């Protein structure tokens, strides 16, 4: 048991790597997207802004027209440590991407709604002058 | 079908109507028509990877788009142009972007202005190698992000500013930035982990100080050895502060060698550590 | 008297670093006057001035030792004010100092006559201010040491800060 | 010394333990973020396209007054 | 030795980092989930405007 | 602005006009005016946290919207009604949502239809406790997701389907669902990661087979010992298969106690593991 | 370019025209122009770093927008004003937001109302130090979030509420909140691991009880000796309950010293721990 633990747990330290390494792989796909999506939402936000503009004009037109075993076991830890730093790297990129976009969602939701109203009002004045 | 044909038709219509042809309403429908033409051309140019032609074409459509009276859509067109030129053959990548921000900024759109502002400072460094002009942008942009309460982005920029400020000898101006970005990081228990590296950078950046500018900054740093995250921060520092106060360019140059084990040094650290390495040598036999 | 804002700097040359004196500009003060550096409403330190061209107007340069005692910083802003001593009851008549090899690189066991140390110390640090617990460097026979004031007496009244004169007896 | 060798193991496992679970989170993570990634691919679609629907409307309205 | 009994928290601390990382992302899911029902539903009304604006074109233009 | 008053006037205008009121034109807008009224009512109803009334109010504005010809914004109202009743104290949360999907479905909006479809199957289970219909919805919903290219979500629902299918005796149908969701997961080497647990669940689910359906399912599983994710799936399984094939309700009951260390056993696993723990004793005493 | 000129023209145009200026119609088209003017001014006042001017300017454009009937975009303007005053030097940062919510709320927009509601309680606490009103907001806001079924968000706010409730001596009312947020966070396996801290906080918060409660809550908690995370919750608590029931202010302050190694104590914990440490002495010397 004594050795079945100083080695088995040692295998866990070795595994402790792929465990925190597979996490990076899982983090990459996330970050890679969070970044890709970040730029996407930029062109997406343009939509809420593009519509925000046109609607103003559209409304006006509708208004104008409407009217050594332990030595290694100690090293593996250092390995985990070096990787722990990485976990911080992603934790920040993921964090700064989350907070920057959440607030972006706010602006999107705002303008999107603001324009929704203009569409409804215009749709109630246009539907009548149909055909 | 061909872009070379479209550019031609677009040209023969992008002319302010006058006299009888102008009639009662010359209309901006012509200039806009041409804009749509050039956009259609620039795109197929972007197909044959002609880039150069794509970009210059977009510049045309956008330029006319200004004569149309619609600064917004034009601005984003300038962005399209920048996107072409950037990953292209010629330059203008810097021009288009400047021509875009001059529009977003004056239009009252800082939120996006900073978005392209950082892209700008990001190119003016990794390409033009114009650090002095890059930092100015990383900074002004961070001011905008900080204006939009977007702490996160603002810090992303500040790190760049200070990060490259120390490279341009601006060490004190660097530590100040690290101190600010460091204080405005504790209020958020979601940055605690990162707050270390900040203190490490700031304690490393030295404006030729000989005192405890760092020996005091290391103390301000609340740490408890069995924390680790922190071990990758002040531990080494302490050992560096002793090696400097004793003009020993061997204890410091050895510590950088050992520390480069538990935590590899990036190009930044390498360059600075070497500068500090020289501040010792020139000081010993002087 | 009233006071004036200044900026901490670095010691010009080693010569002024072996005298334990706050180097200043000739366009501000003069070699001989005394001042009191103010960094906090609870921390008051007294130094001796010594002009030098290298110094820039509106700033006081200190040595590494001093800067490791007063806890200053080349860049911060300090308030220096003129200070006058009362040679009638402040002159040092018997000041004890703790000495120990400054550099661990030059450590020997050879004998060093103290009588000769107190004769060269008063001949180099004469007409200067010293405080209890002050740190500095001493150059004796091309050998650097680390002094540390322990007690200061007048020519008995224990004083926190005094003015080393010519007939100053040091132990 | 046995005592230290046994106490060692005790702390090592308690460590091994906390580890395995942290790994469990990323697994679920990659399954969440991705499940959300597809929820955005349609957004970008419905957005830049809505810009076309609105653009076609604002254009027709203008040419309906001049 | 001590590194083992020590490094133990070097991860228990990260176990907390992800605990928030898993939550942060999930918080965005709901923010984007609702935005998915108001943004898509938004253009939905735009479709009504596209049809209405198209007809006002075949009568007054 | 009295609630019940709005509810009254709204009724005063929600009706085909006639006499001098009808005048020249009809009232396709009257019905819309009423919708806006009831909405204004449900607003203050949601204010005083009287939800119930708010929901019943939205049901009115919504039903009326249909009598106007506007399925879109109508269905959205049904959603508001559902959210109200849901968070509210009465029921109806099921009716509004059904009345919402029929619209998102007939109209041509399956993305959103499935979005509310999962909410539905989730309520019909955690509330009404009607799994026989919940599964039906979880499934049809996953089908819609699987047609929107939306793979993940599709699987999200499938997991629910099989998950609650095995908790209803449908053990075999469960392993089959796990096989499908397991095959449609390998195509994405970004899912390789979760494709384990599926094999674990499937191997655990037993329709009382006498062969080695599990010993075979664990074999089909490609695993490598040094692997980590995998050690959290088949490794245990093998030991459980041996403890079953040897009618030993001790090695199994102790192995499930050990695995519970390296990997915490959720509710599901527990329940099923106990079902197998009884099949062993039952086979011992058969 | 010239804000001082725009503000002037701004007021010179925002006025119900008459005589020949009014003609037949006049109002909306004009007042809106003024709104755009003040926005244009406030913008450069923002780059000018005046803030105060920018804020009051947005207040002008905002107030004006209302005189045109457009509560929506208006309220969003008030948000801009709030953002201004916030990162500015004067007050009004709180007023703008109140003027924003009074609009979003009555408009039936609770989803965004809560968005700025939490921002509000956040300023009213971090700045105004008005905890009594802040709690009222964090709470009502959480109710809105809970209405949208935005669980996580609602919990974020609740955590705020309880967290600042224990600081204001309201210990019992805090544990209750931790109980609620604990019962509505178990069904989701993505919050399992987290439910710990809740039980830890709830067990720490003592309404000066002289018995179980904490010894009962620690029991209600589901833990396993092989648990990893649970080691950072009750395992400590038990030892604390024993050091309390035995009025030993030597075993409590010791165990907290050990725990400050495996899981560092945040400001909160420290504050309350010291409070409990004092209650022990206050029972010893009595």
Q: What is the 3-state secondary structure (H, E, C) of chain B?
A: CCHHHHHHHHHCCCCCCCHHHHCCCCCCHHHHHHHHHHHHHHHHHHHCCCCHHHHHHHHHHHHHHHHHCCHHHHHHHHHHHHHHHHCCCCCCHHHHHHHHHHHHHHHCCHHHHHHHHHHHHHHHHHCCCCHHHHHHHHHHHHHHHHHCCCHHHHHHHHHHHHHHHCCCCCCHHHHHHHHHHHHHHHCCCCCCCCHHHHHHHHHHCCCCCCCCCCCCCCCCCCCCCCCCCHHHCHHHHHHHHHHHCCCCCCCHHHHHHHHHHHCCCCHHHHHHHHHHHHHHHHHHCC
Q: What is the CATH number of domain E1-61?
A: 1.20.5.110
Cα gap E48→E56, rounded to integer Å: 12
Interface contact flag, F73 E33, Cβ < 8 Å: no
Contact predicate B222/B234, CB 8 Å: no
Contact predicate B90/B60, CB 8 Å: no
Q: Are strands C4-10 and C91-97 parallel, antiparallel or unpaired?
A: unpaired
Cα gap F182→F175, rounded to integer Å: 10
SS3 content of chain C, % helix, strand, coil (to 5): 10, 45, 45
HSE value, Cβ hemisphere, 13 Å, CA-based, for F257: 8
Which residues on adjacent β-strands are paired with residue C6?
Answer: C78
Task: List, as one string, the DSSP characters of A56-122.
Answer: HHHHHHHHHS---HHHHHHHHHHHHHHHHHHHHHHHHHHHHHHHHHHHHHHHHHHHHHHHHHHHHHH
Contacts of G46 in chain B (CB under 8 A): 110, 147
Q: Which of G25, G102, G24, G113 is nearest to G66 (CA)?
A: G102
Nearest to A82 among B150, B194, B263 (CB): B263
Cα gap G249→B151, rounded to integer Å: 43
Write the burial class of residue B24 (CB in 10 Å: 0-12 exposed, 13-18 middle, 19+ buried). Answer: exposed
Q: What letter would DSSP give residue G7?
A: H
Q: Which of A2, A21, A77 is nearest to E5 (CA)?
A: A77
Q: How far is CA G35 from CA B108, G57, G61, G71, G74, in A?
A: 13, 10, 4, 13, 9
* Residue D33 C-alpha, separation from nearest chain F C-alpha, in angstroms: 10
- 3+ Cβ–Cβ pairs closer than 8 Å linking C and G: no
Residue in this structure with the two tokens 């860049």, named with its chain if needed:
C75
Cα gap B103→B95, rounded to integer Å: 13
Report the structure determination method.
Answer: cryo-EM
Write the burial class of residue G24 (CB in 10 Å: 0-12 exposed, 13-18 middle, 19+ buried). Answer: exposed
Helix (H) or strand (E) holding C137: strand C135-139
Write the burial class of residue F77 (CB in 10 Å: 0-12 exposed, 13-18 middle, 19+ buried). Answer: buried
Cα gap D61→E54, rounded to integer Å: 8
Residue in this structure with the two tokens 């036999």, named with its chain if needed:
B285
Cα gap F265→F286, rounded to integer Å: 29
Write the burial class of residue G79 (CB in 10 Å: 0-12 exposed, 13-18 middle, 19+ buried). Answer: buried
How many CB atoms are located within 10 Å of the residue B67 CB? 16
CB pairs < 8 Å spanning A and D: 97
Letter string b/e over residues F128-149, b meaning 16 or more CB atoms within 10 A of that residue's CB: eeebeebbebbbbbbebbbebe
Q: Are strands C43-51 and C22-24 parallel, antiparallel or unpaired?
A: parallel
Contact predicate C45/C36, CB 8 Å: yes
Q: Long-range CB contacts (< 8 A, 24+ apart) of A63-66?
A: A64/D65, A65/D61, A65/D64, A65/D65, A65/E56, A65/E60, A66/A125, A66/A129
Contact predicate F85/F52, CB 8 Å: yes
Q: Are strands C128-131 and C22-24 parallel, antiparallel or unpaired?
A: unpaired
Cα gap B71→B80, rounded to integer Å: 14
Q: Which of B105, B108, B148 to mutate to test the interface with G (most CBs of G within 10 A)?
A: B108
Q: What letter would DSSP give residue A131?
A: -
Q: Which residues contact C136 (CB under 8 A, 6 or more apart)?
A: C20, C63, C65, C66, C69, C147
Q: At G91, list the tokens.
A: 């007050």
Neighbours of chain F (3+ CB pairs under 8 A): A, D, E, G
Helix (H) or strand (E) holding C128: strand C128-131
Cα torsion for F41, F45, F48, F50, to the nearest 10°?
A: 160
Which residues on adjacent β-strands are paired with residue C4?
Answer: C80
Cα gap G83→G55, rounded to integer Å: 8
CB proximity under 8 Å: A 49-108 to G: 106
Residue in this structure with the two tokens 């150059």, named with its chain if needed:
C139
Q: Which of G88, G95, G133, G97 is nearest to G117 (CA)?
A: G97
Q: How far is CA F59 from CA F52, F111, F127, F190, G148, in A?
A: 11, 23, 21, 44, 18
Q: What are phi and psi of C169, to 5 degrees?
A: -95, 115
Using only C-alpha atoms, chain B has a radius of gyration, in whole angstroms, of 26
Largest CA distance in chain B: 88
Kindly give the residue spans of alpha helices, DSSP state H, lying in chain G.
3-13, 19-22, 28-47, 52-66, 71-86, 93-106, 110-126, 131-147, 151-167, 172-183, 195-204, 214-220, 234-245, 252-262, 267-284
Cα gap G265→G276, rounded to integer Å: 15
Nearest to D48 among A2, A5, A43 (CB): A43
Distance in Å from the first CA to the final CA of chain G:
73
Cα gap B73→B61, rounded to integer Å: 11
Q: Which of G194, G156, G191 is nearest to G177 (CA)?
A: G156
Q: How far is CA B238 from CA B232, F162, G158, in A?
A: 12, 58, 43
Contacts of E13 in chain B (CB under 8 A): 193, 227-229
Q: At G22, list the tokens.
A: 């009014």
Q: Which residues contact D11 (CB under 8 A, 6 or more apart)?
A: E4, E5, E8
Cα gap G106→G113, rounded to integer Å: 10
Contact predicate F61/F39, CB 8 Å: yes
Cα gap A105→G216, rounded to integer Å: 43
Cα gap A93→E24, rounded to integer Å: 12
Q: At C8, list the tokens.
A: 């901490």
* Residue A67 C-alpha, separation from nearest chain D C-alpha, in angstroms: 11
Contact predicate F203/F209, CB 8 Å: no
Q: At E56, list the tokens.
A: 């006002």
Q: Which of F79, A26, G192, G148 is nearest to E30 (CA)?
A: G148
Q: Which of F94, F100, F92, F18 is nearest to F65 (CA)?
A: F100
Cα gap G45→G126, rounded to integer Å: 26
Q: Which of C12, C70, C73 to mutate to test the interface with B (most CBs of B within 10 A)?
A: C73
Q: Which of C19, C77, C25 is nearest to C48 (CA)?
A: C19
Contact predicate A73/A13, CB 8 Å: yes
Q: State whether residue G175 is helix, strand or coil.
A: helix
Task: List, as one string, the DSSP characters of F36-80.
Answer: HHHHHHHHHHHHTT-THHHHHHHHHHHHHHHTTS-HHHHHHHHHH
Letter string b/e over residues E12-22, b meaning 16 or more CB atoms within 10 A of that residue's CB: bbbbbbbbbbb
Cα gap G257→G251, rounded to integer Å: 10
Q: How many residues does chain E have?
A: 61
Q: Which residues contact G150 (CB under 8 A, 6 or more apart)?
A: E30, E31, E34
Cα gap C24→C30, rounded to integer Å: 8
Q: Which of B259, B132, B283 is nearest to B206 (CA)?
A: B283
CB proximity under 8 Å: G 221-240 to D: 226-229, 231
Contacts of A113 in chain G (CB under 8 A): 72, 109, 112
CB proximity under 8 Å: D 23-62 to G: 25, 28, 32
Contact predicate B159/B121, CB 8 Å: no
- 3+ Cβ–Cβ pairs closer than 8 Å linking B and E: yes
């Amino acid at each position: 048991r004594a050795d079945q633990l100083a080695d088995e747990s040692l295998e866990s330290t070795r595994r402790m790597l792929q465990l925190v390494e597979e996490s990076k792989d899982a983090g990459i796909r996330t970050l890679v997207m969070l970044d890709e999506q970040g730029e996407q939402l930029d062109r997406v936000e343009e939509g809420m802004n593009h519509i925000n503009q046109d609607m103003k004009e559209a409304e006006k037109n509708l208004k104008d027209l409407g009217k050594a075993r332990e030595n290694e076991m100690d090293e593996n830890l250092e390995q985990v440590s070096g990787i722990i730093g990485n976990l911080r790297h992603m934790a920040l990129d993921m964090g700064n991407e989350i907070d920057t976009q959440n607030r972006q969602i706010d602006r999107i939701m705002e303008k999107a709604d603001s324009n929704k109203t203009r569409i409804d009002e215009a749709n109630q004045r246009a539907t009548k002058m149909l055909g | 079908a061909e872009a070379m044909a479209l550019l031609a038709e677009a040209e023969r219509k992008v002319k302010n109507s006058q006299s009888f042809f102008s009639g009662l309403f010359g209309g901006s429908s012509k200039i806009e028509e041409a804009c749509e033409i050039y956009a259609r051309a620039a795109n197929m140019f972007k197909m044959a990877k002609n880039w150069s032609a794509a970009g210059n074409a977009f510049c045309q459509a956008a330029q006319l788009h200004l004569q149309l009276q619609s600064k917004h859509d034009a601005a984003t067109c300038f962005v399209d142009a920048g996107n072409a030129f950037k990953k292209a053959d010629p330059q203008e990548a810097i021009n288009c972007l400047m021509r875009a921000i001059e529009i977003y900024t004056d239009m009252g759109r800082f939120t996006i202005a900073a978005k392209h502002h950082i892209s700008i400072a990001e190119i003016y460094e990794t390409e033009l190698v114009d650090v002095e002009k890059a930092i100015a942008h990383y900074e002004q942009s961070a001011d905008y992000y900080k204006g939009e309460e977007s702490n996160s982005s603002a810090n992303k920029c500040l790190l760049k500013v200070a990060g490259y400020a120390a490279q341009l000898e601006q060490y004190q101006k660097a530590i100040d930035i690290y101190e600010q970005v460091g204080t405005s990081a504790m209020d958020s228990p979601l940055l605690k982990y990162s707050a270390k590296d900040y203190f490490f950078k700031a304690a490393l950046c030295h404006f030729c100080i000989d005192m405890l500018n760092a020996k005091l900054a290391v103390q301000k740093y609340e740490e408890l050895f069995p924390a680790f995250s922190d071990s990758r921060e002040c531990k080494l520092m302490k050992k560096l502060l002793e090696a400097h106060e004793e003009q020993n360019v061997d204890s410091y140059t050895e510590s950088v060698k050992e520390y480069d084990s538990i935590s590899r040094l990036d190009q930044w650290l390498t360059t600075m550590l070497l500068r500090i390495k020289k501040t010792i040598q020139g000081d010993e036999e002087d | 008297m009233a006071g004036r804002s200044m900026q901490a700097a670095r010691c010009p040359t080693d010569e002024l670093s072996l005298s334990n004196c706050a180097v200043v500009s000739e366009k501000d003060y003069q070699s001989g006057q005394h001042v009191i550096v103010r960094t906090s409403p609870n921390h008051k330190y007294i130094f001796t001035l010594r002009t030098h061209p290298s110094v820039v107007p509106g700033s006081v340069a200190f040595s590494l030792p001093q800067r490791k005692w007063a806890g200053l910083s080349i860049g911060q802003e300090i308030e220096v004010a003129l200070y006058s001593f009362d040679k009638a009851k402040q002159c040092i008549g018997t000041m004890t100092i703790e000495i120990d090899f400054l550099q661990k690189k030059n450590i020997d066991s050879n004998p060093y006559d103290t009588d000769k140390m107190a004769a060269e110390f008063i001949q180099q640090f004469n007409n200067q201010a010293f405080s209890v617990g002050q740190q500095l460097v001493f150059s004796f026979n091309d050998k650097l040491f680390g002094l540390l004031v322990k007690d200061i007496e007048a020519m008995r009244q224990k004083i926190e800060v005094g003015l080393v004169v010519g007939n100053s007896q040091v132990a | 010394a046995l005592s230290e060798i046994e106490t060692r193991h005790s702390e090592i496992i308690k460590l091994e333990n906390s580890i395995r679970e942290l790994h469990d989170m990323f697994m679920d993570m990659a399954m969440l973020v991705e499940s959300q990634g597809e929820m955005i691919d349609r957004i970008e679609y419905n957005v830049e396209h809505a810009v076309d629907y609105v653009e076609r409307a604002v254009s027709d309205t203008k040419k309906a007054v001049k | 030795n001590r590194r083992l009994q020590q490094t133990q928290a070097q991860v228990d601390e990260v176990v907390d980092i992800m605990r928030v990382n898993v939550d942060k992302v999930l918080e965005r899911d709901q923010k984007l989930s609702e935005l998915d029902d108001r943004a898509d539903a938004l253009q939905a009304g735009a479709s009504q405007f596209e049809t209405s604006a198209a007809k006002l074109k075949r009568k007054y233009w």
